[PDB]
Amino acid sequence: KDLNELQALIEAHFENRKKEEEELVSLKDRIERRRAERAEQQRIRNER
């Protein structure tokens, strides 16, 4: 039962850190969106 509870919590924190990694990936994606939008608006400013 020690092994059972331990593997249970292992898979549990697996899932938790996995959700956190998904959130961080979405963060990186919106981050690259922010990079692209800052790039285009900066470039527009520089064009003018």
Binding site: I10, E11, R17, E21, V25, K28, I31, R35, R38
Partner: protein, 56 residues
């Protein structure tokens, strides 16, 4: 005229600083993305190991 020249020089300095800072922050974001990619790769390998250990 002296005040105008001072202000113009300040503006040029600040603009160049902002350009450097933007490039540096983008590069550091790239580095963080790469390290996250490595961590995710080894994490997926360990997750496969856990999937096999479920049969262990």
């Amino acid at each position: 005229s002296d005040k105008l020249k001072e202000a113009e020089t300040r503006a040029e300095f600040a603009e160049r600083s902002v350009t450097k800072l933007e490039k540096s922050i983008d590069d550091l974001e790239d580095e963080l993305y790469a390290q996250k990619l490595k961590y995710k790769a080894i994490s997926e390998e360990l997750d496969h190991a856990l999937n096999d250990m479920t049969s262990i």
